[PDB]
């Protein structure tokens, strides 16, 4: 491969290491990283010359047809709009224009350019129209290019490097070498052809270059001109090329994707063109697979347990597939082909359909094909001008087909109107439901509990926030002089900052401020319009409390919130799998825009009236959250009007209804556009975070229930449909979360419902939603779409396109981040490639290349010095990336499921133990006195020679700079503290409780001499945590950066030869692997697409353990003792301390002090303390006391039973008696089991039984040291 010869020497070495030829070393690790940072990026394109492509792809010159930008922008009413070219009002995206004329030249790199300083000045100072339009166009065009985790060229360099040389085979019988090869990929050939336009003297000038402040462009010569779309096309091509290789797809499918992108790029508005024909691929493949005759195969047999509210499922065998079970819904070929005819891409459909017809039976190949084809959709984070986005989304109002007549209301109650009893229909149903819930909320001593009140107030504060300026204005307007703490370096717009200002003020004085402006933000998306973030101010968030509370009660006490408890997201996995099984018919539904359709004229007025009436049952004089009862005029009786008191809850409703009727008033201040901030109101619900899911899920459930039980039976025609539609209820037939929803039909007896009845049913539902202005957007394709998860016949399909390898969202014109953060990006990037099942061997190779580039970085003072550093590669091992090849071992023996942290280290060393010991003896002189785990052979020196300690400690170092304090600012720190504590401790009982607990605790901890300095979670530190978070949200000063680099280097250079005490002790255990465990399911049945004999290790791991989490006796430790806690503190810290105390045998008052330290009253403290026992605790619950946790990668596997009865901590016939844990086994055995299973999961291949065989020291010695360490911390 001449390309391998083209690489420079260090990169050739790195490629050899990645191929598994040689063990990786820090030396070559640096040489590769360094040289990448010094050579120009264009050379990566230069590498493409040495690929003899043989693919049938032609790049039409139609691409280079820049449409003039001047006609794509205009300003009216002093705002820069997009003025769409086509008559479609949605063409509001970046056009296809030549950016060239707007460029100057840089002094550093003369070839590339940036915006004219003249243009931006005139747009800023003169507000000149054309200047502003040019600026806006330049800003957004640059931003669209910036939507990548790093420069795409670097990723392309990674792909070439790994693909430059075939990987060496391992000894495994399932290690199939790659079937795909270069010179056959249409993507790379396409990149070659298109890039031929950008060379002048064989130099291959990149069309653009991304920088921290955005992206720069190259000035074209007089002959040529660069269209911004080309850059986007390159990114899509590179992303597709990487994905195709990792997914190992046929070149034909990649060919179709290339043609797909080219056609989109040829026309104007590359983004808009792609967006229009988005769903073509899933419709062609996923929605229509088995609509033929030769159907068959094996399918999972999943059963839903009787208490369906618990969402518990059981795998109970397999089911043979046959024609009677084949999908009933019509295919999707006709509409898709009709759409494709518009863009004359019918060939793509013909190719896809013909290829699809080669999979008549459901098996691994079929789903693998589906996974690959669905991976063809564009992975670009689309971005448009926020001004257009806000103008296009919130300009919608629902259309009600039968409005509530005005005569249907009673007389006013000051603001609200009650609903007349004579009114029926869905509105009546909605009214009663909310009213009933309001009644239940009304009398509930759960509130007025001071602890619960603390939870609600604390829930309102986060590091982020907004609308602070509106807050300061509104209160200053009403004569309220708020405090300030600027010297305490914390952002004013933080929700924390405004909360501190409010602490002292009597609440009712603030009531006028709730009718104030709210700022807004935008977050871009991959396959849809960008999302919206609308953070209310703290006061508004407080007022809306009743709305949330009632919604919560509706959810938690009707359909159990339809999984909106979100305890572990994986509970939806078995649900959709069950929903997609052949015996069941499922329908996917979701509100078209629930945020935009909920409104006051129809919905909120009804809810407000119901809540206000529902609160009538209760003491009319009972203040709630500092809101006192007031007098309101009642005008229900025209003959006898009067005024009566109303409780604080009702007063809240009175104002809340007023606000909703007035409509939200937003203020847009987009930065990408130029000087165009303004404010306009809308009825669109905020819906900026999970706090909105409760309301929409409640209304979603309510309307669905009424439709099923009342509207549909009264209106449908088919008698058979009526027969099956009856005996159906939401609690066992429907789930939802926000707009999203799933509806599944009762099992038709050995049969399926007529599509005719389905059409009748679906039609009526659409009309039902049309009544009150909900577009239901339903579909029926015998698949499962819920929370962006896809299941087909009980097999999960990872939609990889939603996690593009290169793409990353950036919501601001500047990246605003520092170099070390890139490491965390790499770690998160790699995990997705594990969550989604890719070719695990090749994905690992690519990951290391990414890591190598990220391993190095530098910084420069605003005026002064530069700084630099880089990590030894062992860091990434500690961070959770398996090594490819260790010295003395064979490559590719470590599975991706290897746990991060100490566990991964221990497992690696445990396997590597014997070779290290023997090799150290030959190579080095013995150490001077005996070692606990090692002999005299002195492996630690060898590890230092490998730089293991350097990497091990380097990964421990922090990666974000720290802000500095000040003393007059500390007066503000105290002022900030005092007020935060004041806001937290509204009453006095909590303060007395915490103070008593803290005083007793330190007294006990010192006098009993457990230890001193134990940072125990307590409420007094919660404000401190808030303050630190608030100060951290600020951009750090350069001095902090310099401290980081210096500290990091010193930590790297310091010669240390010891791990943490825990890892040192963990090495004392010897673990061995026996035979394979009995299988969970039939290996024939596919469960996750791509986890097949080709991708062996995933296929092994899933097959052995089974995917369905089925903790019938374990419950994965979710039964934490402290169900109710305040924000800021960590439950996982609290229970760990409690168990640690219990193991240490502390006296009960120690528990009492600790519990009282977090607000628990003495009585409940005793009650809680009594529950603490080593028996009822779960394996993971107790094992976490020493930070032994379950890796996130395991959350999709049924590891419970294995850990329970497959990891033998003491097998009688194998273990040495020295390792017998004896009585301490009650808390020793879980630790050993966790270590054992971690090692077993580390190695590749099938899961084997794990057995402790020996502890070098006695088990007693191990337990004693552990108790010491537990007492120390």
């Amino acid at each position: 491969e001449e390309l391998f010869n083209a690489l420079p020497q260090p990169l050739q070495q790195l490629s050899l290491a990645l191929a598994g030829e040689i063990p990786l070393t820090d030396h070559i690790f640096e040489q590769a990283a360094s040289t990448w940072h010094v050579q120009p990026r264009s050379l990566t394109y230069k590498l493409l010359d040495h690929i003899p492509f043989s693919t049938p792809v032609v790049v039409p010159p139609s691409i280079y047809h820049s449409l003039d930008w001047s006609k794509c922008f205009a300003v009216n009413q002093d705002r820069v709009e997009r003025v769409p070219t086509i008559d479609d009002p949605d063409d509001v995206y970046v056009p296809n224009s030549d950016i060239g004329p707007l460029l100057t030249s840089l002094h550093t790199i003369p070839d590339y350019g940036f915006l004219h300083p003249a243009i931006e000045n005139d747009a800023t100072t003169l507000r000149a129209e054309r200047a502003r339009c040019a600026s806006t166009f330049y800003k957004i065009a640059s931003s669209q290019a910036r939507q990548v985790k790093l420069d795409p060229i670097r990723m392309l360099g990674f792909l070439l490097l790994v693909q430059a040389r075939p990987r060496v085979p391992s000894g495994l019988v399932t290690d199939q070498p790659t079937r795909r090869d270069p010179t056959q990929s249409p993507a790379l050939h396409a990149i070659w052809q298109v890039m031929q336009y950008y060379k002048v003297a064989g130099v291959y000038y990149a069309p653009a270059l991304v920088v921290p402040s955005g992206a720069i462009w190259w000035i074209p010569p007089p002959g040529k001109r660069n269209v911004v779309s080309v850059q986007y096309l390159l990114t899509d091509l590179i992303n597709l090329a990487i994905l195709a290789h990792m997914t190992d797809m046929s070149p034909t499918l990649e060919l179709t994707g290339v043609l797909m992108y080219l056609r989109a790029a040829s026309s104007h508005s590359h983004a808009y063109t792609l967006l229009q024909m988005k769903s073509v691929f899933p419709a062609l493949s996923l929605r229509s697979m088995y609509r033929n005759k030769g159907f068959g195969g094996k399918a999972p047999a999943i059963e839903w347990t009787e208490p369906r509210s618990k969402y518990k499922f059981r795998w109970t065998g397999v089911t043979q597939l046959h024609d009677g079970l084949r999908p009933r819904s019509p295919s999707m070929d006709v509409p898709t082909l009709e759409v494709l005819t518009k863009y004359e891409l019918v060939d793509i459909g013909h190719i896809i359909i013909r290829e699809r017809n080669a999979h008549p039976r459901h098996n691994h190949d079929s789903v693998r094909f589906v996974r690959d084809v669905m991976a063809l959709t564009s992975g670009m984070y689309l971005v448009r001008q926020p001004t257009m986005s806000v103008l296009r989304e919130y300009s919608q109002v629902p259309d009600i087909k039968d409005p509530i007549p005005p005569s249907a209301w009673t007389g006013p109650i000051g603001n609200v109107r009650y609903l007349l009893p004579s009114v029926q229909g869905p509105a009546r149903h909605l009214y009663d439901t909310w009213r009933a819930a309001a009644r239940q909320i009304a009398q509930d001593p759960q509130w007025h509990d001071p602890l619960n009140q603390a939870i609600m107030r604390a829930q309102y504060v986060t590091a982020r926030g907004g609308s602070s300026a509106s807050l300061k204005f509104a209160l200053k307007v009403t004569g309220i002089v708020l405090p300030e703490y600027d010297d305490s370096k914390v952002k004013k717009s933080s929700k924390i900052y405004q909360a501190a200002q409010i602490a002292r003020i009597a609440f009712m004085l603030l009531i006028a401020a709730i009718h104030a402006e709210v700022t807004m933000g935008i977050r871009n998306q991959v396959q849809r319009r960008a999302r919206s973030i609308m953070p209310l101010n703290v006061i508004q968030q407080a007022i809306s409390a009743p709305h949330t509370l009632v919604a919560n009660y509706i959810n938690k006490h009707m359909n159990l919130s339809t999984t909106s408890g979100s305890v572990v997201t994986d509970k939806v996995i078995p649900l959709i799998l069950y929903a997609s099984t052949p015996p069941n018919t499922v329908v996917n539904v979701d509100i078209k825009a629930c945020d935009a359709s909920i409104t006051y004229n129809y919905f909120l007025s009804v809810i407000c009236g119901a809540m206000h009436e529902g609160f009538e049952v209760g003491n009319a004089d009972a203040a709630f959250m500092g809101v006192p009862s007031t007098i309101v005029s009642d005008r229900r009786s025209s003959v006898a009007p009067y005024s009566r008191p109303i409780s604080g809850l009702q007063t809240m409703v009175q104002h809340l209804a007023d606000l909703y009727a007035a409509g939200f008033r937003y203020s847009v201040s987009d930065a990408f556009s130029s000087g165009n901030k303004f404010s306009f109101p809308t009825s669109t619900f905020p819906s900026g975070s999970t706090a909105t899911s409760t309301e929409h899920t409640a209304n979603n459930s309510t309307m669905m229930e009424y439709f099923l039980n009342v509207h549909a039976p009264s209106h449908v025609k088919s008698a058979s449909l009526k027969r099956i539609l009856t005996d159906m209820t939401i609690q066992r037939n429907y789930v939802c979360q926000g707009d999203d929803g799933i509806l599944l039909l009762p099992h038709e007896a050995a049969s399926k419902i007529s599509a005719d009845d389905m059409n009748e049913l679906l039609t009526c539902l659409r009309d039902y939603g049309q009544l009150f202005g909900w577009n239901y957007d339903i579909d029926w394709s015998d698949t499962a779409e819920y929370l962006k998860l896809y299941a087909l016949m009980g097999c999960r399909i990872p939609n990889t396109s939603r996690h593009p390898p290169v793409g990353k969202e950036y919501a601001a014109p500047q990246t605003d981040e520092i170099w070390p953060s890139l490491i965390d990006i790499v770690i998160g990037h790699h995990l997705n490639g594990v969550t989604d099942v890719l070719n695990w061997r090749e994905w690992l190779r690519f990951s290391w290349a990414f890591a190598c580039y990220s391993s190095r970085g530098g910084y420069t003072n605003p005026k002064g010095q530069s700084f630099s550093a880089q990590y030894p590669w062992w860091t990434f091992v500690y961070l959770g990336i398996p090594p490819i090849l260790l010295p003395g071992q064979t490559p590719f023996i470590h599975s991706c499921y290897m746990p991060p942290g100490d566990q991964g280290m221990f497992s690696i060393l445990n396997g590597w133990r014997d070779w290290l010991i023997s090799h150290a003896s030959t190579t080095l002189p013995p150490l001077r006195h005996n070692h606990p785990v090692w002999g005299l052979s002195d492996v630690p020196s060898l590890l230092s020679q490998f730089g293991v300690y350097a990497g091990y400690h380097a990964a421990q170092h922090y990666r974000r700079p720290k802000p500095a304090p000040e003393t007059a600012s500390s007066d503000s720190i105290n002022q900030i503290t005092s007020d935060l504590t004041e806001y937290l401790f509204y009453d006095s009982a909590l303060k007395a409780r915490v103070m008593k607990g803290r005083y007793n605790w330190e007294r006990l901890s010192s006098s009993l001499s457990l230890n001193v300095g134990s940072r125990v979670p307590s409420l007094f530190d919660v404000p401190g945590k808030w303050v630190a978070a608030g100060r951290d949200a600020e951009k750090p000063p350069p001095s902090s950066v310099e401290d980081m680099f210096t500290s990091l280097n010193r930590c790297i250079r310091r010669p240390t030869h010891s791990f943490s005490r825990l890892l040192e002790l963990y090495l004392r255990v010897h673990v061995t692997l026996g035979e394979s465990i009995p299988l969970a399911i039939d290996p024939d049945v596919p469960q996750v697409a791509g986890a097949d004999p080709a991708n062996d290790d995933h296929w092994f791991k899933y097959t052995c353990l089974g995917d369905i989490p089925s903790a019938t006796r374990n419950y994965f430790g979710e039964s934490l003792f402290v169900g109710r806690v305040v924000s800021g503190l960590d439950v996982e810290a609290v229970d760990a301390t409690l168990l640690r105390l219990k193991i240490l045998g502390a006296p009960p008052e120690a528990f009492i002090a600790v519990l009282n330290g977090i607000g628990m009253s003495d009585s409940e403290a005793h009650q809680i303390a009594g529950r603490i026992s080593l028996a009822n605790a779960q394996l993971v619950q107790i094992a976490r006391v020493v930070h032994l946790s379950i890796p996130s990668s395991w959350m999709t596997l049924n590891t419970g039973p294995y850990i329970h009865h497959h990891a033998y901590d003491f097998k009688p016939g194998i273990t040495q008696p020295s390792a017998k844990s004896r009585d301490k086994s009650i808390w020793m055995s879980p630790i050993l089991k966790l270590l054992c299973t971690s090692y077993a999961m580390t190695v590749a291949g099938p899961v084997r039984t794990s057995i402790v065989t020996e502890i070098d020291g006695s088990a007693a010695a191990l337990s004693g040291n552990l108790r010491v360490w537990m007492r120390d911390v």
Binding site: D444, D449, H1166, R1171, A1175
Partner: protein, 99 residues
């Protein structure tokens, strides 16, 4: 019922405090080598919901209007009919219902 209950709780010398009960329960000695500790099972029940036992006052208030409304034991607070007497949580539930 709500009004009367509030009045009752407003004026009463009785104070509900479970500290002595738990103190008298947790002092019972038992082996730590067993796999089930019924003490934990008990204390997992009797969970103080923090409402200061509204049910008790609610039951008392209901008596004044028994001719209009009746208080019933919640269905969920029953032992499942599928269980055996040896299933300890079921037995404790039945005990509480009897009391």
């Amino acid at each position: 019922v709500e009004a009367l209950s509030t009045l009752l709780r407003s004026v009463t010398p009785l104070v509900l405090d479970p500290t002595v009960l738990t103190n008298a329960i947790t002092t019972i000695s038992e082996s730590t080598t067993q796999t089930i500790s019924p003490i934990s099972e008990i204390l997992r029940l009797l969970q103080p919901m923090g409402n200061d036992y509204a049910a008790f006052w609610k039951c008392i208030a209901s008596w004044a209007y028994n001719g209009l409304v009746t208080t019933v034991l919640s269905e969920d607070a029953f032992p499942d009919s599928s269980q055996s007497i040896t299933h300890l949580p079921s037995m404790w539930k039945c005990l509480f219902l009897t009391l």
